Ligand SMILES: O=C(O)CNC(=O)C(=O)O
Ligand SMILES: [Mg+2]
Ligand code: NI
């Protein structure tokens with residue numbers, strides 16, 4: 267069995283290997299990459315996402331989100347308070363202000379220490395979940411707006427044609443902006459490209475051990491667990507590496523820098539934080555290997571998780587017994 271310790275693997279495809287996206291994912295899996303839940307892909311030196319970022323300041327962040335924490339430093343939830351619209355140029359100036367900027371630090375490890383010590387005492391503002399793309403239309407390789415759709419994959423594998431669309435999302439971050447512990451909708455893959463700015467640190471639990479994280483989360487957030495049988499779908503809970511180690515939960519960590527891709531694999535729980543002002547693009551995708559994970563994915567029916575239009579058909583075809591209850595949650 268390849269990669270039996272479930273380590274995060276890093277890949278350096280050549281420009282020739284960068285042509286065929288599906289083939290390269292399958293290659294990484296042949297080497298055991300999926301066992302970690304997360305892989306890094308460094309693009310060939312010849313490749314670029316677009317010519318420059320000199321012209322992005324006029325993108326609008328219609329609903330910036332202030333991420334307010336509750337709990338203790340290593341075990342907390344966050345809620346999102348909506349703020350007034352601002353441009354990316356306005357948000358970048360805010361990120362660089364004395365109130366929000368990255369503190370002085372020695373290296374990524376010192377910064378990670380400071381994040382876990384101090385995160386709860388601040389409320390950073392995240393420009394998350396903005397429909398759109400920064401890839402040039404002429405970029406032919408690993409262009410996240412030109413990928414094969416999940417609807418087309420389901421049709422190819424299973425024969426059934428369904429409604430729905432699959433488009434990318436932009437994320438503008440600042441110091442301490444946080445993504446809570448989660449898997450993707452319907453336990454899909456994700457791919458994330460860091461277009462510019464400061465790094466993003468990731469934590470990940472191997473898919474074979476995801477239920478150990480779920481059992482810990484039920485213990486640590488006991489009210490939330492009584493409220494919903496899949497409350498990590500709410501994407502509000504944080505647990506630090508120190509607390510995971512104290513509880514014996516297998517995990518790994520890695521830092522993504524500008525110009526690098528990360529892929530998350532079906533049922534790979536992940537969480538993390540941004541080091542300073544940055545911009546990332548991400549989208550969900552599927553392969554043949556996903557279908558069995560989609561059939562078994564948990565679902566929130568309490569009403570909190572509220573998701574996209576396109577998830578209806580996935581539930582309806584892959585999970586017909588759950589469909590009725592899940593849709594009551596959505597309405
Ligand atoms: O970058 C973020 O805030 C969160 N990203 C992801 O969870 C992802 O790409 O799957
Ligand atoms: Mg602009
Ligand atoms: Ni994710």
Ligand SMILES: [Zn+2]
Nearest residue numbers: 494566568570
């Ligand atoms: Zn729920």
